[PDB]
Design a protein around this ligand. Sequence first.
Ligand SMILES: Nc1ncnc2c1ncn2COCCNS(=O)(=O)NC(=O)CCCC[C@@H]1SC[C@@H]2NC(=O)N[C@@H]21
Ligand SMILES: [Cl-]
Length: 263
Amino acid sequence: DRDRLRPPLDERSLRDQLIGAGSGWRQLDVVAQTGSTNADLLARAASGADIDGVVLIAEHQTAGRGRHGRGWAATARAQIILSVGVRVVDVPVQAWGWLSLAAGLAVLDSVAPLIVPPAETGLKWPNDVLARGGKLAGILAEVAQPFVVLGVGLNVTQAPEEVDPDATSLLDLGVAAPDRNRIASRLLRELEARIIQWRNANPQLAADYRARSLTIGSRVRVELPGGQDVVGIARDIDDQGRLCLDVGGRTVVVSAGDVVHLR
Ligand SMILES: Nc1ncnc2c1ncn2COCCNS(=O)(=O)NC(=O)CCCC[C@@H]1SC[C@@H]2NC(=O)N[C@@H]21
Ligand SMILES: [Cl-]
């Protein structure tokens, strides 16, 4: 079935394209299986390793992490499962929130042309990559000074029945034979540019995010950490990467939470 549409990644090829002159990526490894690529890179940094510009890709992830203590389901060779290390200590802490937003924009730009784009194809705050209403990719940013580990889970041929009822994949969107080697290459290249833009506070980063946001201008219900709900209209993203809500004339700024686009 879908397994035949899932050939293995070419580590040697990815290294030839992404490592060398003109590229910031220093190290790239493809492992057959791990618990969590985010956990692994955090473990490396915890033992003194310099993970800046280091890429770890897993064909399969058995104990995937999600935001707010949730999980991330996956089957072998059905997704692009990677984590990258980013040195952030040179950047003010108030701007670290934009790093995760930049990541989702990069993931989206890497797969957007492969799709015609149906309704609801863009970014849901924080960095949910949505397509036709379904969650195409999820991003997780975890802190390990002086680094931030950026995690990306992109559904390539992953069936929604195998992971989550609200999930979608490139295959379920119409992409017949998605090449994970091509996509991963474009992903990390888009990611490199966005990280550089974030590090230098490039205005275009925020501009490109707004142009691809599905949340801004929509009536939403935001489920805050702690279990409280806030209903209003998303208006803008501030300089810290936080969602600014219009609640009956009052401005409510949210740093973290789950966004639901309402009727
Ligand atoms: N394949 C799925 N597709 C869509 N929804 C899903 C799926 N599998 C469960 N779900 C349901 O989503 C639960 C997670 N919800 S969430 O709070 O928004 N969290 C995220 O979306 C961030 C997940 C980040 C995963 C990446 S992948 C490699 C790296 N290592 C990690 O351990 N984490 C990062
Ligand atoms: Cl199917």
